[PDB]
A = this chain, B = another copy of it.
Amino acid sequence: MVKKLFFILSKEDKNFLFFLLVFSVFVSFIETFAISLVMPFITLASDFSYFDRNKYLISLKEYLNIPVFEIIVYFGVGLIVFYVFRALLNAYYFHLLARFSKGRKHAIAYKVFSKFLNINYEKFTQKNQSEILKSITGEVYNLSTMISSFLLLMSEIFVVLLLYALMLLINYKITLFLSIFMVLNAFILVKILSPIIKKAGLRREEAMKNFFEILNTNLNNFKFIKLKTKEDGVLSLFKAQSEAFSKANITNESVAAVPRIYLEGIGFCVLVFIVVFLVLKNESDISGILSTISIFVLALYRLMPSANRIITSYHDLLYYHSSLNIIYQNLRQEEENLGEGKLSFNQELKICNLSFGYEGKKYLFKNLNLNIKKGEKIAFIGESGCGKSTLVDLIIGLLKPKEGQILIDKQELNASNAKNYRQKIGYIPQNIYLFNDSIAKNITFGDAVDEEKLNKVIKQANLEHFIKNLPQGVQTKVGDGGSNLSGGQKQRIAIARALYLEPEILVLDQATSALDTQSEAKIMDEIYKISKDKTMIIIAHRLSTITQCDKVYRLEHGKLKEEK
Protein backbone atom coordinates (compact mmCIF):
# COMPACT_ATOMS: atom_id res chain seq x y z
CA MET A 1 0.00 0.00 0.00
CA VAL A 2 3.12 2.16 -0.16
CA LYS A 3 3.08 2.11 -3.96
CA LYS A 4 0.00 4.35 -3.83
CA LEU A 5 2.02 7.26 -2.42
CA PHE A 6 4.86 7.03 -4.95
CA PHE A 7 2.36 7.48 -7.79
CA ILE A 8 1.13 10.96 -6.76
CA LEU A 9 4.34 12.93 -6.01
CA SER A 10 6.79 14.08 -8.72
CA LYS A 11 10.61 13.87 -8.76
CA GLU A 12 11.47 17.40 -7.59
CA ASP A 13 9.03 16.82 -4.75
CA LYS A 14 10.92 13.61 -3.96
CA ASN A 15 14.21 15.51 -3.75
CA PHE A 16 12.50 18.10 -1.55
CA LEU A 17 10.98 15.30 0.55
CA PHE A 18 14.21 13.44 1.33
CA PHE A 19 15.84 16.82 1.86
CA LEU A 20 13.19 17.49 4.51
CA LEU A 21 13.79 14.02 6.00
CA VAL A 22 17.54 14.50 6.42
CA PHE A 23 16.75 17.96 7.76
CA SER A 24 14.27 16.38 10.20
CA VAL A 25 16.87 13.95 11.56
CA PHE A 26 19.38 16.82 11.71
CA VAL A 27 17.37 19.22 13.86
CA SER A 28 17.03 16.37 16.37
CA PHE A 29 20.80 16.38 16.85
CA ILE A 30 20.82 20.17 16.93
CA GLU A 31 18.17 20.23 19.67
CA THR A 32 19.78 17.60 21.85
CA PHE A 33 23.02 19.53 21.42
CA ALA A 34 21.37 22.81 22.44
CA ILE A 35 20.16 21.05 25.57
CA SER A 36 23.26 19.00 26.40
CA LEU A 37 25.68 21.92 26.01
CA VAL A 38 24.31 23.42 29.23
CA MET A 39 25.80 20.85 31.62
CA PRO A 40 29.45 21.48 30.71
CA PHE A 41 29.04 25.25 30.61
CA ILE A 42 27.02 25.26 33.83
CA THR A 43 29.46 22.99 35.69
CA LEU A 44 32.67 24.65 34.46
CA ALA A 45 31.45 28.20 35.08
CA SER A 46 31.66 27.50 38.81
CA ASP A 47 33.87 26.92 40.48
CA PHE A 48 36.61 28.63 38.47
CA SER A 49 38.72 25.50 38.77
CA TYR A 50 38.65 22.56 36.33
CA PHE A 51 41.06 24.61 34.17
CA ASP A 52 43.86 23.80 36.59
CA ARG A 53 42.89 20.14 36.80
CA ASN A 54 41.08 17.59 34.61
CA LYS A 55 43.00 15.84 31.82
CA TYR A 56 40.63 17.23 29.18
CA LEU A 57 40.11 20.92 30.05
CA ILE A 58 43.81 21.87 30.06
CA SER A 59 44.50 20.73 26.48
CA LEU A 60 42.57 23.49 24.68
CA LYS A 61 44.14 25.95 27.13
CA GLU A 62 47.68 24.58 26.90
CA TYR A 63 47.29 24.50 23.10
CA LEU A 64 48.62 28.07 23.31
CA ASN A 65 45.59 30.11 22.25
CA ILE A 66 43.91 31.27 25.45
CA PRO A 67 45.14 32.36 28.90
CA VAL A 68 42.83 31.27 31.74
CA PHE A 69 39.98 33.78 31.71
CA GLU A 70 39.00 33.72 28.04
CA ILE A 71 37.90 30.09 28.15
CA ILE A 72 34.43 31.00 29.42
CA VAL A 73 33.86 34.22 27.47
CA TYR A 74 34.70 32.75 24.06
CA PHE A 75 32.80 29.52 24.73
CA GLY A 76 29.77 31.48 25.85
CA VAL A 77 29.77 33.77 22.83
CA GLY A 78 30.09 30.63 20.73
CA LEU A 79 26.95 29.31 22.36
CA ILE A 80 24.90 32.49 21.91
CA VAL A 81 25.88 32.57 18.25
CA PHE A 82 24.87 28.91 18.18
CA TYR A 83 21.47 29.86 19.60
CA VAL A 84 20.89 32.72 17.17
CA PHE A 85 21.92 30.09 14.63
CA ARG A 86 19.11 27.88 15.94
CA ALA A 87 16.70 30.83 15.92
CA LEU A 88 17.35 31.01 12.19
CA LEU A 89 17.66 27.27 11.51
CA ASN A 90 14.39 25.99 12.94
CA ALA A 91 12.61 28.84 11.16
CA TYR A 92 14.11 27.74 7.85
CA TYR A 93 13.15 24.13 8.54
CA PHE A 94 9.50 25.02 9.16
CA HIS A 95 9.60 27.26 6.08
CA LEU A 96 10.64 24.28 3.97
CA LEU A 97 7.87 22.21 5.55
CA ALA A 98 5.26 24.86 4.74
CA ARG A 99 6.64 25.36 1.24
CA PHE A 100 6.48 21.64 0.64
CA SER A 101 3.01 21.06 2.06
CA LYS A 102 1.20 23.96 0.43
CA GLY A 103 3.26 23.84 -2.76
CA ARG A 104 2.00 20.29 -3.01
CA LYS A 105 -1.53 21.49 -2.14
CA HIS A 106 -1.19 23.52 -5.32
CA ALA A 107 0.48 20.86 -7.49
CA ILE A 108 -1.66 17.74 -6.93
CA ALA A 109 -4.96 19.67 -6.82
CA TYR A 110 -3.99 20.92 -10.26
CA LYS A 111 -3.84 17.30 -11.45
CA VAL A 112 -7.18 16.37 -9.88
CA PHE A 113 -8.93 19.37 -11.42
CA SER A 114 -7.35 18.63 -14.81
CA LYS A 115 -8.34 14.96 -14.71
CA PHE A 116 -11.88 15.95 -13.78
CA LEU A 117 -11.78 18.21 -16.82
CA ASN A 118 -10.63 15.38 -19.07
CA ILE A 119 -13.18 12.90 -17.73
CA ASN A 120 -16.34 12.36 -19.78
CA TYR A 121 -19.50 14.40 -19.19
CA GLU A 122 -21.79 11.73 -17.75
CA LYS A 123 -19.38 10.49 -15.07
CA PHE A 124 -18.55 14.09 -14.17
CA THR A 125 -22.24 15.03 -13.92
CA GLN A 126 -23.46 11.88 -12.14
CA LYS A 127 -21.65 12.69 -8.91
CA ASN A 128 -22.57 15.87 -7.01
CA GLN A 129 -20.23 18.87 -7.12
CA SER A 130 -19.66 18.59 -3.36
CA GLU A 131 -17.77 15.36 -4.03
CA ILE A 132 -15.72 16.97 -6.80
CA LEU A 133 -14.95 20.24 -4.99
CA LYS A 134 -13.95 18.28 -1.90
CA SER A 135 -11.97 15.96 -4.18
CA ILE A 136 -9.90 18.84 -5.58
CA THR A 137 -9.57 21.21 -2.59
CA GLY A 138 -10.17 19.22 0.60
CA GLU A 139 -8.28 15.96 0.26
CA VAL A 140 -5.31 17.91 -1.07
CA TYR A 141 -5.03 20.14 2.01
CA ASN A 142 -5.54 17.10 4.21
CA LEU A 143 -2.75 15.17 2.50
CA SER A 144 -0.35 18.12 2.52
CA THR A 145 -0.76 18.82 6.23
CA MET A 146 -0.65 15.05 6.72
CA ILE A 147 2.83 14.79 5.19
CA SER A 148 4.02 17.80 7.18
CA SER A 149 2.75 16.01 10.28
CA PHE A 150 4.68 12.89 9.25
CA LEU A 151 8.02 14.65 8.75
CA LEU A 152 7.57 16.51 12.03
CA LEU A 153 6.71 13.13 13.59
CA MET A 154 10.03 11.70 12.37
CA SER A 155 11.86 14.72 13.74
CA GLU A 156 10.27 14.40 17.17
CA ILE A 157 10.53 10.64 17.60
CA PHE A 158 14.20 11.18 16.82
CA VAL A 159 14.41 13.94 19.44
CA VAL A 160 12.69 11.59 21.91
CA LEU A 161 15.04 8.66 21.25
CA LEU A 162 18.11 10.91 21.32
CA LEU A 163 17.28 12.74 24.55
CA TYR A 164 16.11 9.52 26.19
CA ALA A 165 19.44 7.94 25.28
CA LEU A 166 21.25 11.00 26.61
CA MET A 167 19.34 10.77 29.89
CA LEU A 168 20.13 7.06 29.97
CA LEU A 169 23.80 7.95 29.67
CA ILE A 170 24.00 10.92 32.05
CA ASN A 171 22.32 9.35 35.07
CA TYR A 172 21.68 5.65 34.51
CA LYS A 173 19.77 5.45 37.80
CA ILE A 174 17.34 8.36 37.78
CA THR A 175 16.12 7.92 34.19
CA LEU A 176 14.54 4.52 34.96
CA PHE A 177 12.76 5.86 38.02
CA LEU A 178 11.43 8.84 36.08
CA SER A 179 10.46 6.48 33.26
CA ILE A 180 8.33 4.12 35.33
CA PHE A 181 7.05 7.17 37.18
CA MET A 182 6.23 8.95 33.90
CA VAL A 183 4.27 6.15 32.25
CA LEU A 184 2.33 6.06 35.52
CA ASN A 185 1.82 9.82 35.50
CA ALA A 186 0.28 9.68 32.02
CA PHE A 187 -1.96 6.88 33.26
CA ILE A 188 -3.31 9.03 36.08
CA LEU A 189 -4.22 11.71 33.52
CA VAL A 190 -5.70 9.58 30.74
CA LYS A 191 -7.49 6.81 32.66
CA ILE A 192 -8.54 8.43 35.96
CA LEU A 193 -9.26 12.04 34.96
CA SER A 194 -10.18 12.39 31.26
CA PRO A 195 -13.32 10.22 31.41
CA ILE A 196 -14.58 12.22 34.41
CA ILE A 197 -13.79 15.46 32.58
CA LYS A 198 -15.86 14.06 29.72
CA LYS A 199 -18.56 13.31 32.29
CA ALA A 200 -18.78 16.80 33.78
CA GLY A 201 -18.45 18.28 30.30
CA LEU A 202 -21.43 16.38 28.97
CA ARG A 203 -23.37 17.28 32.12
CA ARG A 204 -22.79 20.99 31.50
CA GLU A 205 -23.65 20.57 27.83
CA GLU A 206 -26.99 18.94 28.63
CA ALA A 207 -27.99 21.23 31.50
CA MET A 208 -27.32 24.31 29.35
CA LYS A 209 -29.63 22.93 26.66
CA ASN A 210 -32.42 22.13 29.13
CA PHE A 211 -32.15 25.46 30.92
CA PHE A 212 -32.33 27.46 27.70
CA GLU A 213 -35.23 25.31 26.55
CA ILE A 214 -37.57 25.84 29.48
CA LEU A 215 -36.53 29.47 29.56
CA ASN A 216 -37.60 29.72 25.93
CA THR A 217 -40.97 28.01 26.33
CA ASN A 218 -41.52 30.11 29.45
CA LEU A 219 -40.94 33.23 27.39
CA ASN A 220 -43.19 31.74 24.73
CA ASN A 221 -46.12 31.53 27.14
CA PHE A 222 -46.11 34.98 28.72
CA LYS A 223 -49.58 35.93 27.53
CA PHE A 224 -50.80 32.90 29.46
CA ILE A 225 -48.62 33.59 32.51
CA LYS A 226 -49.89 37.15 32.97
CA LEU A 227 -53.50 36.01 32.62
CA LYS A 228 -52.85 33.23 35.10
CA THR A 229 -51.71 35.75 37.71
CA LYS A 230 -49.54 33.12 39.41
CA GLU A 231 -46.00 33.81 38.26
CA ASP A 232 -44.21 31.82 40.96
CA GLY A 233 -45.48 28.66 39.26
CA VAL A 234 -42.90 28.94 36.48
CA LEU A 235 -40.20 30.35 38.78
CA SER A 236 -40.65 26.98 40.48
CA LEU A 237 -39.34 25.51 37.22
CA PHE A 238 -36.74 28.15 36.44
CA LYS A 239 -35.05 28.02 39.84
CA ALA A 240 -35.08 24.26 39.41
CA GLN A 241 -33.37 24.05 36.04
CA SER A 242 -31.05 27.00 36.69
CA GLU A 243 -29.59 25.34 39.78
CA ALA A 244 -28.95 22.12 37.89
CA PHE A 245 -27.11 24.09 35.24
CA SER A 246 -25.37 25.99 38.04
CA LYS A 247 -24.24 22.69 39.55
CA ALA A 248 -23.08 20.86 36.44
CA ASN A 249 -21.31 23.97 35.22
CA ILE A 250 -19.30 24.18 38.46
CA THR A 251 -18.43 20.49 38.55
CA ASN A 252 -17.15 20.95 35.01
CA GLU A 253 -15.39 24.25 35.67
CA SER A 254 -13.83 22.69 38.79
CA VAL A 255 -12.71 19.30 37.49
CA ALA A 256 -10.86 21.03 34.66
CA ALA A 257 -8.29 22.57 37.01
CA VAL A 258 -7.40 19.33 38.81
CA PRO A 259 -4.62 18.30 36.37
CA ARG A 260 -2.43 21.43 36.43
CA ILE A 261 -2.37 21.83 40.22
CA TYR A 262 -1.78 18.11 40.36
CA LEU A 263 1.19 18.75 38.05
CA GLU A 264 2.69 21.49 40.24
CA GLY A 265 2.25 19.60 43.51
CA ILE A 266 3.60 16.36 42.10
CA GLY A 267 6.11 18.53 40.25
CA PHE A 268 7.90 19.39 43.48
CA CYS A 269 6.95 16.23 45.37
CA VAL A 270 8.86 14.07 42.90
CA LEU A 271 11.91 16.29 43.37
CA VAL A 272 12.02 16.12 47.17
CA PHE A 273 11.81 12.31 47.42
CA ILE A 274 14.65 11.91 44.94
CA VAL A 275 16.65 14.36 47.00
CA VAL A 276 15.97 12.42 50.23
CA PHE A 277 16.89 9.16 48.48
CA LEU A 278 20.27 10.31 47.15
CA VAL A 279 21.31 11.17 50.72
CA LEU A 280 21.74 7.55 51.85
CA LYS A 281 24.86 7.49 49.67
CA ASN A 282 27.42 10.27 49.28
CA GLU A 283 27.78 11.65 45.74
CA SER A 284 26.35 15.19 45.73
CA ASP A 285 29.26 17.37 44.59
CA ILE A 286 27.73 20.70 45.67
CA SER A 287 27.04 21.65 42.03
CA GLY A 288 26.57 18.00 41.07
CA ILE A 289 23.08 17.59 42.51
CA LEU A 290 22.07 20.73 40.60
CA SER A 291 24.12 19.93 37.49
CA THR A 292 22.28 16.66 36.89
CA ILE A 293 18.98 18.27 37.97
CA SER A 294 19.26 21.19 35.54
CA ILE A 295 19.92 18.64 32.79
CA PHE A 296 17.01 16.30 33.59
CA VAL A 297 14.70 19.28 34.05
CA LEU A 298 15.77 20.52 30.63
CA ALA A 299 15.34 17.04 29.13
CA LEU A 300 11.84 16.46 30.51
CA TYR A 301 11.00 20.02 29.44
CA ARG A 302 12.02 19.41 25.82
CA LEU A 303 10.53 15.89 25.77
CA MET A 304 7.01 16.95 26.73
CA PRO A 305 6.43 18.89 23.47
CA SER A 306 7.98 16.07 21.44
CA ALA A 307 5.50 13.65 22.98
CA ASN A 308 2.64 16.10 22.36
CA ARG A 309 3.58 16.56 18.70
CA ILE A 310 3.86 12.78 18.42
CA ILE A 311 0.33 12.25 19.78
CA THR A 312 -1.20 15.07 17.74
CA SER A 313 0.47 13.81 14.57
CA TYR A 314 -0.80 10.36 15.55
CA HIS A 315 -4.41 11.54 15.71
CA ASP A 316 -3.95 13.37 12.41
CA LEU A 317 -2.49 10.18 10.95
CA LEU A 318 -5.53 8.24 12.13
CA TYR A 319 -8.37 10.71 11.59
CA TYR A 320 -7.15 12.05 8.24
CA HIS A 321 -4.58 10.73 5.73
CA SER A 322 -5.65 7.19 4.80
CA SER A 323 -9.32 8.01 4.19
CA LEU A 324 -8.12 10.23 1.34
CA ASN A 325 -5.43 8.18 -0.42
CA ILE A 326 -7.77 5.48 -1.75
CA ILE A 327 -10.17 8.24 -2.79
CA TYR A 328 -7.28 9.70 -4.77
CA GLN A 329 -6.75 6.34 -6.44
CA ASN A 330 -10.36 6.55 -7.62
CA LEU A 331 -9.70 9.95 -9.18
CA ARG A 332 -6.44 9.71 -11.12
CA GLN A 333 -6.83 6.14 -12.31
CA GLU A 334 -10.35 7.21 -13.21
CA GLU A 335 -10.61 7.10 -17.00
CA GLU A 336 -10.96 10.02 -19.40
CA ASN A 337 -12.69 10.54 -22.72
CA LEU A 338 -11.31 9.81 -26.20
CA GLY A 339 -11.64 10.65 -29.89
CA GLU A 340 -9.92 12.40 -32.79
CA GLY A 341 -11.06 13.15 -36.34
CA LYS A 342 -13.39 15.46 -38.27
CA LEU A 343 -16.95 15.42 -39.61
CA SER A 344 -18.78 17.63 -42.10
CA PHE A 345 -22.16 19.30 -41.69
CA ASN A 346 -23.76 20.90 -44.76
CA GLN A 347 -27.15 19.18 -44.82
CA GLU A 348 -28.82 17.52 -41.84
CA LEU A 349 -28.56 16.58 -38.19
CA LYS A 350 -30.46 13.32 -38.42
CA ILE A 351 -31.21 11.83 -35.00
CA CYS A 352 -32.61 8.36 -35.68
CA ASN A 353 -33.98 6.44 -32.70
CA LEU A 354 -32.35 7.97 -29.61
CA SER A 355 -33.72 5.96 -26.67
CA PHE A 356 -31.76 7.15 -23.66
CA GLY A 357 -31.51 6.40 -19.94
CA TYR A 358 -29.03 7.18 -17.17
CA GLU A 359 -27.10 4.92 -14.77
CA GLY A 360 -30.25 3.59 -13.10
CA LYS A 361 -32.62 3.89 -14.95
CA LYS A 362 -35.90 3.92 -16.87
CA TYR A 363 -35.48 5.14 -20.45
CA LEU A 364 -36.34 8.80 -21.01
CA PHE A 365 -37.13 8.46 -24.73
CA LYS A 366 -37.26 4.97 -26.21
CA ASN A 367 -37.07 5.75 -29.93
CA LEU A 368 -36.85 9.53 -30.25
CA ASN A 369 -36.79 10.97 -33.77
CA LEU A 370 -36.20 14.20 -35.65
CA ASN A 371 -33.68 15.83 -37.97
CA ILE A 372 -32.14 19.29 -38.08
CA LYS A 373 -31.37 20.90 -41.46
CA LYS A 374 -28.46 23.35 -41.55
CA GLY A 375 -29.93 26.69 -40.46
CA GLU A 376 -33.30 25.45 -39.21
CA LYS A 377 -33.37 27.31 -35.87
CA ILE A 378 -35.56 24.86 -33.94
CA ALA A 379 -36.85 25.01 -30.35
CA PHE A 380 -37.85 22.42 -27.74
CA ILE A 381 -41.06 23.37 -25.96
CA GLY A 382 -41.46 21.22 -22.88
CA GLU A 383 -43.33 21.01 -19.60
CA SER A 384 -40.05 21.80 -17.84
CA GLY A 385 -37.78 18.91 -16.91
CA CYS A 386 -39.28 16.41 -19.37
CA GLY A 387 -35.97 15.82 -21.15
CA LYS A 388 -35.82 18.59 -23.74
CA SER A 389 -32.46 19.71 -22.37
CA THR A 390 -31.35 16.07 -22.41
CA LEU A 391 -32.58 15.78 -25.99
CA VAL A 392 -30.50 18.81 -26.97
CA ASP A 393 -27.55 17.41 -25.04
CA LEU A 394 -27.75 14.23 -27.08
CA ILE A 395 -28.19 16.20 -30.30
CA ILE A 396 -25.07 18.16 -29.44
CA GLY A 397 -21.78 16.49 -28.57
CA LEU A 398 -22.57 15.38 -25.01
CA LEU A 399 -24.26 12.20 -23.74
CA LYS A 400 -23.80 8.76 -25.31
CA PRO A 401 -27.08 7.27 -26.65
CA LYS A 402 -28.21 3.76 -25.68
CA GLU A 403 -29.66 2.75 -29.06
CA GLY A 404 -29.09 5.82 -31.22
CA GLN A 405 -26.87 6.92 -34.10
CA ILE A 406 -27.40 10.66 -34.65
CA LEU A 407 -26.36 11.19 -38.26
CA ILE A 408 -24.58 14.24 -39.63
CA ASP A 409 -24.88 14.32 -43.43
CA LYS A 410 -25.62 10.56 -43.43
CA GLN A 411 -22.45 9.99 -41.39
CA GLU A 412 -22.62 8.42 -37.93
CA LEU A 413 -21.68 10.54 -34.91
CA ASN A 414 -19.45 8.71 -32.43
CA ALA A 415 -16.47 9.19 -30.11
CA SER A 416 -13.91 9.83 -32.86
CA ASN A 417 -15.41 12.98 -34.34
CA ALA A 418 -17.06 13.94 -31.06
CA LYS A 419 -14.23 16.41 -30.48
CA ASN A 420 -14.95 18.44 -33.59
CA TYR A 421 -18.72 18.21 -33.12
CA ARG A 422 -18.48 19.50 -29.57
CA GLN A 423 -16.23 22.26 -30.97
CA LYS A 424 -18.85 23.66 -33.35
CA ILE A 425 -21.48 24.67 -30.78
CA GLY A 426 -21.98 27.66 -28.48
CA TYR A 427 -24.35 27.62 -25.51
CA ILE A 428 -25.64 30.92 -24.06
CA PRO A 429 -27.09 29.59 -20.74
CA GLN A 430 -29.15 32.78 -20.08
CA ASN A 431 -28.55 32.47 -16.32
CA ILE A 432 -24.79 32.51 -16.62
CA TYR A 433 -21.82 32.13 -14.29
CA LEU A 434 -19.08 34.65 -14.97
CA PHE A 435 -15.83 34.46 -13.04
CA ASN A 436 -14.36 37.59 -11.45
CA ASP A 437 -12.42 39.18 -14.33
CA SER A 438 -12.38 41.70 -17.19
CA ILE A 439 -15.43 41.08 -19.45
CA ALA A 440 -13.18 40.11 -22.40
CA LYS A 441 -12.16 37.35 -20.08
CA ASN A 442 -14.68 35.76 -19.43
CA ILE A 443 -16.10 35.87 -23.03
CA THR A 444 -12.83 34.48 -24.45
CA PHE A 445 -12.81 32.07 -21.50
CA GLY A 446 -9.12 32.53 -20.72
CA ASP A 447 -7.71 31.79 -24.18
CA ALA A 448 -5.92 35.13 -24.66
CA VAL A 449 -7.31 37.74 -27.07
CA ASP A 450 -7.57 38.63 -30.76
CA GLU A 451 -8.62 42.30 -30.79
CA GLU A 452 -10.10 42.07 -34.30
CA LYS A 453 -12.34 39.07 -33.67
CA LEU A 454 -13.18 40.32 -30.17
CA ASN A 455 -14.32 43.63 -31.65
CA LYS A 456 -16.27 41.76 -34.33
CA VAL A 457 -18.05 39.91 -31.54
CA ILE A 458 -18.72 42.95 -29.32
CA LYS A 459 -20.10 44.65 -32.41
CA GLN A 460 -22.12 41.53 -33.22
CA ALA A 461 -23.33 41.05 -29.64
CA ASN A 462 -24.58 44.66 -29.55
CA LEU A 463 -22.64 45.85 -26.51
CA GLU A 464 -20.81 48.81 -28.05
CA HIS A 465 -22.88 51.34 -26.10
CA PHE A 466 -22.09 49.42 -22.91
CA ILE A 467 -18.37 49.15 -23.57
CA LYS A 468 -18.30 52.85 -24.42
CA ASN A 469 -20.03 53.74 -21.16
CA LEU A 470 -17.51 51.93 -18.96
CA PRO A 471 -14.62 53.76 -17.19
CA GLN A 472 -11.81 51.29 -17.86
CA GLY A 473 -13.91 50.26 -20.85
CA VAL A 474 -13.44 46.63 -21.89
CA GLN A 475 -11.20 45.98 -18.89
CA THR A 476 -13.65 46.50 -16.02
CA LYS A 477 -13.94 43.79 -13.36
CA VAL A 478 -17.27 41.95 -13.26
CA GLY A 479 -16.91 41.70 -9.47
CA ASP A 480 -17.91 38.05 -9.52
CA GLY A 481 -20.81 37.28 -11.81
CA GLY A 482 -22.41 40.69 -11.39
CA SER A 483 -22.25 42.34 -8.82
CA ASN A 484 -20.69 44.78 -11.31
CA LEU A 485 -22.89 43.42 -14.11
CA SER A 486 -26.64 42.88 -14.47
CA GLY A 487 -28.97 40.41 -16.25
CA GLY A 488 -29.01 41.84 -19.77
CA GLN A 489 -25.25 42.37 -19.69
CA LYS A 490 -24.80 38.79 -18.49
CA GLN A 491 -26.97 37.41 -21.30
CA ARG A 492 -25.29 39.46 -24.05
CA ILE A 493 -21.80 38.75 -22.73
CA ALA A 494 -22.63 35.04 -22.85
CA ILE A 495 -23.91 35.53 -26.40
CA ALA A 496 -20.52 37.08 -27.09
CA ARG A 497 -18.81 34.09 -25.48
CA ALA A 498 -20.63 31.64 -27.74
CA LEU A 499 -20.22 33.85 -30.81
CA TYR A 500 -16.49 33.89 -30.17
CA LEU A 501 -16.58 30.19 -31.02
CA GLU A 502 -18.69 31.06 -34.10
CA PRO A 503 -20.13 28.08 -35.94
CA GLU A 504 -22.33 26.15 -36.45
CA ILE A 505 -25.06 25.23 -33.97
CA LEU A 506 -26.08 27.77 -31.37
CA VAL A 507 -27.62 26.03 -28.39
CA LEU A 508 -29.74 28.36 -26.27
CA ASP A 509 -30.62 26.91 -22.89
CA GLN A 510 -33.14 29.46 -21.71
CA ALA A 511 -34.10 28.80 -18.10
CA THR A 512 -37.40 29.23 -16.30
CA SER A 513 -38.57 32.87 -16.47
CA ALA A 514 -36.65 35.94 -17.62
CA LEU A 515 -39.00 38.76 -16.60
CA ASP A 516 -40.03 39.78 -19.04
CA THR A 517 -40.67 41.21 -22.49
CA GLN A 518 -38.71 44.28 -21.40
CA SER A 519 -35.60 42.13 -21.90
CA GLU A 520 -36.29 38.90 -23.80
CA ALA A 521 -38.49 40.31 -26.60
CA LYS A 522 -35.63 42.52 -27.87
CA ILE A 523 -32.73 40.14 -27.26
CA MET A 524 -34.63 37.43 -29.17
CA ASP A 525 -34.91 39.70 -32.22
CA GLU A 526 -31.19 40.44 -31.95
CA ILE A 527 -30.59 36.68 -31.82
CA TYR A 528 -32.77 36.07 -34.87
CA LYS A 529 -30.75 38.71 -36.69
CA ILE A 530 -27.38 37.23 -35.62
CA SER A 531 -28.30 33.55 -36.06
CA LYS A 532 -28.97 33.97 -39.78
CA ASP A 533 -25.73 32.35 -40.99
CA LYS A 534 -25.91 29.48 -38.50
CA THR A 535 -28.24 26.85 -37.03
CA MET A 536 -29.85 27.08 -33.59
CA ILE A 537 -31.28 24.82 -30.90
CA ILE A 538 -33.41 26.45 -28.20
CA ILE A 539 -34.28 24.70 -24.93
CA ALA A 540 -37.47 26.67 -24.32
CA HIS A 541 -39.36 26.38 -21.02
CA ARG A 542 -42.47 28.47 -21.70
CA LEU A 543 -43.64 30.49 -24.70
CA SER A 544 -43.62 33.95 -26.35
CA THR A 545 -39.96 33.36 -27.31
CA ILE A 546 -40.50 30.85 -30.12
CA THR A 547 -42.30 33.26 -32.46
CA GLN A 548 -39.73 33.34 -35.29
CA CYS A 549 -38.71 29.69 -34.84
CA ASP A 550 -39.12 27.55 -37.98
CA LYS A 551 -39.84 24.33 -36.07
CA VAL A 552 -41.40 23.67 -32.68
CA TYR A 553 -41.19 20.18 -31.20
CA ARG A 554 -43.04 19.45 -27.98
CA LEU A 555 -41.50 16.78 -25.81
CA GLU A 556 -43.81 15.32 -23.19
CA HIS A 557 -44.01 11.91 -21.51
CA GLY A 558 -42.57 10.19 -23.20
CA LYS A 559 -42.35 10.81 -26.94
CA LEU A 560 -41.89 13.79 -29.28
CA LYS A 561 -44.89 15.42 -30.96
CA GLU A 562 -44.54 18.14 -33.61
CA GLU A 563 -46.44 21.34 -32.76
CA LYS A 564 -45.84 23.77 -35.61
Contact = CB atoms under 8 A, between A and B. Distances in A.
A106 B242 contact: yes
A72 B279 contact: yes
**Copies per complex of this chain:** 2
Interface string A112-142: 0110011001001100010011001100000
Contacts of A227: 396-398, 422-423, 425-427, 501
Interface in A98-120: 98-99, 101-103, 105-106, 109-110, 113-114, 117-118
Contacts of A396: 227
A429 interface: yes
A398 B73 CA distance: 88
Contact of A110 (B230, B238, B436): B238
A253 B80 contact: no
A87 B290 contact: no
A103 to B, nearest CB: 5
Nearest to A222: B124
Contacts of A46: 275, 278-279, 284-290
Nearest to A255: B91
Interface in A64-105: 69, 72-73, 76-77, 79-80, 83-84, 86-87, 90-91, 94-95, 97-99, 101-103, 105
A243 B103 CA distance: 7
A446 B234 CA distance: 6
Contacts of A133: 215-216, 219
A274 to B, nearest CB: 10
A220 interface: yes
A41 interface: yes
A30 to B, nearest CB: 11
A465 interface: no
Contact of A217 (B110, B269, B427, B435): B435
The range of chain A's interface size is: 35 or more
A264 interface: yes
A272 B269 CA distance: 30
A422 to B, nearest CB: 5
Contact of A235 (B114, B219, B261): B114
Given A249-B98, A446-B237, A272 B435 contact: no
A447 interface: yes
B257 A215 contact: no
Contact of A215 (B113, B216, B268): B113
A415 interface: no
A236 B125 CA distance: 23
A445 interface: yes
21 contacts: A46-B288, A46-B289, A47-B284, A47-B285, A72-B279, A87-B261, A87-B264, A90-B264, A94-B253, A95-B257, A98-B253, A102-B249, A113-B235, A113-B238, A117-B235, A217-B434, A221-B435, A227-B427, A228-B422, A229-B423, A286-B287
Interface of A: 34, 38, 41-42, 45-48, 69, 72-73, 76-77, 79-80, 83-84, 86-87, 90-91, 94-95, 97-99, 101-103, 105-106, 109-110, 113-114, 117-118, 121, 124-125, 129, 132-133, 136-137, 210-231, 233-239, 242-243, 245-246, 249-251, 253-254, 257-258, 261-262, 264-266, 268-269, 272-273, 275-276, 278-279, 282, 284-291, 293-294, 396-398, 419, 422-423, 425-427, 429, 433-436, 445-447, 480-481, 497, 501
Given A87-B261, A121-B226, A286-B286, 12 more contacts: A76-B276, A83-B264, A94-B254, A98-B250, A106-B245, A110-B238, A113-B235, A125-B222, A228-B501, A229-B422, A233-B445, A290-B290
